[PDB]
Symmetry: D2
Subunit: 292 residues, 4 copies
């Protein structure tokens, strides 16, 4: 078993004033709330016990949206981050939830998509030691954690938002950890940025030779909804795929069902209330259509 | 003086599950909350005393977002609609707010844009008799109120969502009324749809020869965000204009400044808490730029 | 009697490799060739006699697409620009075509759209002395002819691509001239960047107190297809309008019919060969539907 | 040894009037001509010897855009298809080019993208007996060749544009064939639509138990640029990927270099004439960056 966390707080300042009305993680990416996407990432990694961390004001809305997750065969729990003082705080806030288990953290505004993503998640999730992170070639690596490799392809340094990146490979917002993470987070001090950085967590594993950095190839989409423009692009991306395929990206209900965490009758039940719109009609179609 | 009403309730069924998260009128259109758009419409019609109607769960969140309106030189009030039992219910809920004044109703998910919109609005709003509605050529008139004209261009019938529309002219979700509307709404009975219909209101006016139907030409954009696809498209439309012009559509702060409802000093104050993003930067820039 | 010129040449080094295949003005913007847009602008300005300038290689193409114009009630003529040595060259190449008449120049990659644009063009067209241009607020004025206004809104200076723009107002690619333009253009010497600049022609009028600069308001859309991104956005812009309205933008046959330049009968013959697709069906519908 | 064919002709039919001036396969998909996309698919499949088939009027245009291929390490040949009389005509027109070799056909308006596409292609290319095709779940299967599967996942029938489709799986425009294909195509009679159908070619192999139908999973994008709306969607799709990643899709120069069909000296010589725009800057960057 691994336990997962979604970090779905922050201010969403870049998204002002849209986010005055509410969390960037409840606004829609095309047809469904942003949070569905990372939730689904965790689900596809075989994780069913998940803690959602948000701001004090938006926590209740997540709870209304998602509940305890039992309807979807999950065990969802909630905690508050008082202030967005770093990714690594997820491990302090979530210490008791983690207990002595393997864990995973996904950022609330990250969206992933691509052929065999299930396998890429499984590989990381099934490991039982160290840390795993994913490196993705981006245009503006300065906005992210940046991994440098040597000539042989081995990662040699990490830097958080460097003005002068040492490569174009960003560390994405998905991280898998062994039982060493909590203790590492606890010994962290705030960065000059004023945050407890996930990059310092990861450097600590790197230093001990225990960070696995796996390339996420160009054939995958890793997007993030942090800007007005990026959020619209993500929306359009999802739209184009779903209207082409007649299939939906990141339907928790679908994923649950395919993973056998809920059964046909349960799914039919989930569909009923949503039946007056296309999402409901889609859940129903899933009962009598085989999709490879 | 004319008083305004924003109907910002409904279930937003077509946007499920995105709207299980929050009211459709709190979702963004590109860069700002949907409600900014109809609010701006009323503002551009010279209306500053506005009633916002929403559901029992969301009415307070709109209150949370916009407060009493004084920071923007407006007088905003709030009322709850217990069930989305029809647009015409705005006049019963809003009966005491209206008093013996002229009124205007704008729908929460309607977005307008175009050259001389201010003039178009002013003309309807400055009339002191009958009713005024706007007729816009659409692809799928079956989804709206439809107005049929004689050979002479005079409006001769209205039908709500006809299976066989008599024309391609839709009645947009903006309505201006004299003192007769409250009594007309109070006598309406539910339609076969189970709704108290604005179309029936407008018909009563038409029957007494007191309905002005003005054409809103093809040069204007009238959009509604009722479906996932249309919400996205409105987002892209707005983004294209804004990214081209370096001007923003339906920024209430800007419009209030321009109508002299607030002065330079007030605007500098509104910009301050927003200064860390592009939207606050833009309000600041307006203090030192003449825009024609 | 005013004659039109469409300047549709230009290096394709930029949008290479897209434009290695097809010159820019032959590429579509959503559903019809780019040149339809500026062609429609001239038509909406009441101009029937039009000269299309392209590269030597592209003139046959333009001719194949458009012909002599007679089927749309136009008089189209063609000329070549060997080298893209400046917009003002259009008046040297077009000297014989213009003769002793008033003229208008439109850029081949410029798309305009908005309420009462007809009336806007008319105001410039009716002026018989001097020149008329339009000013549009843009995000990146450094990329255009920039017009500076004094505190009372009078145009006081023009600079082509200033490093330090004096305003955010661009002079758009739509220019109206009296009889003086050809001699002005003859006297011009190339600018530092080596082009015979339209900005210089406009300044010659300005220095004589004969330049009328009109504001093209923010309710108008003025787009150019100069970048991959900007072409894309212009495509989505037209698509949203067209799909919303069930009406099409810059359809020359429609414009010609509305202007009485061709009759019902002529339009039905234009429609027949296009009848298997949407565009021909749209033209047919125009025959049986009144559009205000 | 497998040879390739791109079929890049076609009525033009619809996209009128966008395609009066030129063929659909020369239109840009965001930043490069559409033909680059299927061209790159064959390249990614390890195919260097390719035949491009088009119309009398367009074949030349393709030749001018791409030449003989030698600068990209390719051997490109051209042939004309007099009338768009069916996809299986490619095997007639292409008979001498193919000789006794294995072959692959791709449709000129098909765009594929996804993680491990190269491995997907390889799998099919390495099967030297019979045929291989791909099945992709779509919303409107009635537009395509449709493939039906039994309860156990085996392909059991094909139907071209069926009125009542038996599944939602379309056969994509990418086909691998052994030596039997030419004769199979030779023996075909046109269908009740008037075409020599690839679906009949495919059926022929199926009826011999020699058709391999592989699932192309939902993690892949398979788009058809055959409508106005679909071309725009594909453009946005590419743009979103390229702008997020700083890597281009279907850049033949890159693919050639990565396959070692050209060396760095060659790649630099290709970058030179494009150096004044982003495209050439990208090529140059590829000489000094490792991309995984
Ligand atoms: C810095 C920080 C970000 N976030 C959220 C916002 C986004 O979903 C994501 C990336 O910033 O993390 C938090 O929830 N807490 C924090 O301390
Ligand atoms: C099976 C399945 C996959 N996916 C996603 C995971 C991948 O990014 C992609 C390919 O499996 O689709 C869903 O979003 N829902 C699903 O039910
Ligand atoms: C029918 C109905 C709609 N609405 C809102 C939803 C949209 O913004 C719009 C049109 O359905 O009005 C209400 O607020 N109350 C209602 O009773
Ligand atoms: C003046 C002004 C106009 N607008 C809108 C009103 C019209 O639809 C268009 C042209 O004035 O722009 C704004 O959104 N904000 C403004 O400050
Ligand atoms: C500079 C120049 C541009 N152009 C065209 C390309 C575009 O449509 C536009 C603006 O750069 O004018 C010419 O046709 N000739 C020229 O000499
Ligand atoms: C009347 C008409 C206008 N237009 C454009 C001109 C303007 O930008 C807008 C408003 O009339 O629509 C067309 O494209 N075609 C037409 O037939
Ligand atoms: C039917 C047909 C299609 N095509 C092309 C047009 C498109 O790219 C594709 C599928 O319609 O094949 C031909 O080149 N020749 C043909 O005979
Ligand atoms: C290696 C490489 C892949 N691709 C495409 C192929 C696949 O669809 C995707 C993943 O390798 O990207 C390119 O377009 N160019 C390339 O250079
Ligand atoms: O989004 P943030 O909190 O500015 O940055 C976070 O985002 C990225 C993922 O989206 C990560 O690579 C960064 O290392 C992390 O700090
Ligand atoms: O959106 P609704 O509740 O189905 O319909 C409402 O909105 C339309 C505008 O959006 C109007 O034409 C209809 O007359 C009105 O009933
Ligand atoms: O596109 P160009 O030749 O760099 O620029 C031209 O186009 C602009 C509008 O499209 C004008 O404002 C410029 O004055 C003119 O030089
Ligand atoms: O586009 P067409 O010629 O109608 O159809 C062709 O294209 C499709 C892919 O684009 C295939 O599934 C069809 O079997 C083929 O006949």
């Amino acid at each position: 078993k691994r336990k997962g966390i979604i970090l779905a707080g922050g201010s969403g300042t870049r998204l002002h004033p849209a986010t005055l009305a509410i969390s960037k993680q409840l606004l829609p990416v095309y047809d469904k709330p942003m949070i569905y996407y990372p939730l689904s990432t965790l689900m596809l990694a075989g994780i069913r016990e998940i803690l959602i961390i948000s701001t004090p004001q938006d926590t209740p809305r997540f709870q209304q949206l998602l509940g305890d997750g039992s309807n979807w065969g999950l065990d969802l729990q909630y905690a508050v981050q008082p202030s967005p003082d770093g990714l690594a705080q997820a491990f302090l806030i979530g210490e008791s939830f983690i207990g002595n288990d393997l864990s995973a953290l996904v950022l609330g505004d990250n969206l992933y998509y691509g052929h065999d993503f299930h396998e890429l998640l499984g590989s990381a999730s099934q490991r039982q030691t160290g840390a795993s992170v994913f490196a993705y070639h981006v245009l503006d690596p300065e906005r992210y954690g940046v991994v440098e490799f040597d000539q042989g392809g081995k990662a040699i340094s990490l830097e958080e938002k460097p003005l002068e990146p040492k490569s174009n490979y960003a560390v994405t917002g998905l991280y898998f950890y062994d039982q060493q993470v909590v203790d590492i987070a606890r010994d962290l001090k705030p960065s000059p940025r004023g945050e407890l950085e996930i990059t310092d967590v990861n450097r600590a594993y790197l230093e001990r030779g225990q960070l696995s950095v796996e390339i996420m190839g160009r054939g995958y989409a890793w997007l993030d909804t942090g800007t007005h423009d990026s959020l619209l692009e993500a929306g359009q991306f999802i739209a184009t795929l779903e209207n082409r395929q007649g299939l939906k990206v990141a339907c928790p209900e679908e994923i649950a069902y395919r993973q056998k965490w809920i059964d046909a009758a349960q799914l039919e039940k989930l569909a009923a209330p949503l039946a007056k719109n296309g999402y409901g009609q889609y859940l129903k179609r899933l009962l009598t259509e085989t999709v490879y």
